[PDB]
Amino acid sequence: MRVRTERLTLAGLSVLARIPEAPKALLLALHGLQGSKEHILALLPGYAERGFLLLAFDAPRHGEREGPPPSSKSPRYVEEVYRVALGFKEEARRVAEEAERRFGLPLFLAGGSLGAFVAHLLLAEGFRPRGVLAFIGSGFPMKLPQGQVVEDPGVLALYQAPPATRGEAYGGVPLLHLHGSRDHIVPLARMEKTLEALRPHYPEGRLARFVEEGAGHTLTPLMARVGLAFLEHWLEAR
Amino acid sequence: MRVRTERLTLAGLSVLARIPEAPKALLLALHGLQGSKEHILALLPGYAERGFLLLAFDAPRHGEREGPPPSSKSPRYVEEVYRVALGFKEEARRVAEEAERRFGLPLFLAGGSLGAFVAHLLLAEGFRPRGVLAFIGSGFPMKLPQGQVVEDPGVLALYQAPPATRGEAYGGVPLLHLHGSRDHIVPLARMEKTLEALRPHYPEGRLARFVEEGAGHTLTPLMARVGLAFLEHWLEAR
Structure with missing residues (x-):
């Protein structure tokens, strides 16, 4: 499918969008630390081409927004990282409800x-x-x-x-974690701890993990393809 | 995609085939103990529709072949199960090479x-x-x-x-293990032991795992859908 890059205004922020001719669903994408709305959409090849209306916006202190972003060499790094996260969460909820x-x-x-x-x-x-x-x-x-x-x-x-x-x-919302076994920024074990914490609250078949052996802290094209299939699976269901 | 089912002869064996009108790749599928060629192809929904010409044949002692299969009550159960595996291996290589x-x-x-x-x-x-x-x-x-x-x-x-x-x-051949966390016939740990043994020999990645939380010893529709994404990623790779 052909895809047009365009900017909207939702919940008062500027959101980068990739809109297909016959959208079948929306995908709000939230980037990582030191990333940006352009970065995360570029890591999701083929999604919009399949019918997903993609949307991404810059978290606080990132991208086109006023910085500077958190520095890992500062003693206030963690606090700043999660202040950004809490702001990003509040914004995302509104961006999604409007979208x-x-x-x-x-x-x-x-x-x-x-x-x-x-x-x-x-x-x-x-x-x-x-x-x-x-x-x-x-x-x-x-x-x-x-x-x-x-x-x-x-x-x-x-x-x-x-x-x-x-x-x-969590309401049993279908959830797939995709990870690299050699990630040093988010150790594999923290992803596994997350899955084990959530396991008992998830009906069978709604929670899963995909691990690319050897991959690090990068959203690889293989992970992207697997995630695309997971969203189609739940979109075409019941 | 029109798909039709037929019986072919490959390497001298009767092979069930699900043939799309526009095949882009072959998938030879090997069923499990007490299963059959029809059972394993039925657990791969959507694959032929996406362009995979599916092939499956019955293992020694299974399906249409003279049986019964190995019985767990026998002192020679394991011996008989792996002799079926060795026979099935030799046949599969001939079928694959002919296909x-x-x-x-x-x-x-x-x-x-x-x-x-x-x-x-x-x-x-x-x-x-x-x-x-x-x-x-x-x-x-x-x-x-x-x-x-x-x-x-x-x-x-x-x-x-x-x-x-x-x-x-193994020559770094792309390999994805798909498993259910609650499988007790093949414990999750045996699959993990497999990947850990192979890990040093897959220095360039291409080894991966997908685990569905709560699933047991069944090939679930979500596993099939993830496996189809893995095959398309490697088919399209250049």
Whole structure:
């Protein structure tokens, strides 16, 4: 399918869009730390060409928005990363609720790294999309390095009760985690911890994982193809 | 896509074929213990419609062939199960090589349970398809139950040197293991042991796993859909 790149205004932010002629569904994509709305859409080859109306926006301090983004060399890095995440979550929820209204179609969510964590924050807070792809990520915030200072109440609360520890709130929304076995930014074990926390709250067949052996912290074209099949599976179901 | 079913003769065996009107690749499918050629093709919905010419034949002692198959009550159960696997392997390689000569299309393998182990036996002996789907299975033979007697030299050889311990002979052929977390016939850990044995021999990736949380020892529609994405990714690769 031919695909047109265009900008809308939803929930008051500027969203990059890829709209197909006969859209069959929407896909809101949330990028990773140090990423951008152009970056995440480029990592989803063939999706719009198959009928998914893609939408991405820059998280706080990223892309065209005012920086600077968090620096891993700062003792306030973690706090800034999750302040960005909490803002990204609040924005995403509104972007999705509007998008649905402006385009009237089933909506799925995709997030890479920080965006996958935000996808978990959204599900834990009751957001109900038709399915979620969580790439190179986790439902627990990153291990907190020694030497950091965290005083923000929102950030402390996410560490005290990570979203993946609230599986009962996820509504069994279909969820696929896609990961690389050698990821050093989000260790494989944190993705597996997320799946094990969610397991008991998910009806059989609705929760799954795909692991590319040897891959690191990169949303590979293989992961992208598998995620595309997963969204079509739930879109064509029941 | 029009698809028709027919019986062909390849390498002297009766092969069930599901033929699309526009074949872009071949998929030889190898059923599991107590299964049959019709059962394994029925568990691959949508594959022929996407352009895969599916082929399946009955393993020794199964389906239309003189049986019965091995019975778990027998002290020679394991011996008989792996002699069926060795026979099935030798036949499958001849069927695959004839199908490739005849249709000139990229060839992939899919195996379910014992058929997944047969796919491993083929890779360990240097058969080089474009990619392999190993559903609900493992590259190691089952744990030997107490009371089993194994005298067949060919089966003893499989325990002495399981195929997954010969990763260097696999030639980095793309391989995806698809499994259910609650499978007790082939425990999840046997599939993980397979991948860990092969990992050092797949330094360029192309090895992967897909685990459906809550699924058991069945080839689920979600597994089939993910396996079709893996095959299309490798078919399209350049």
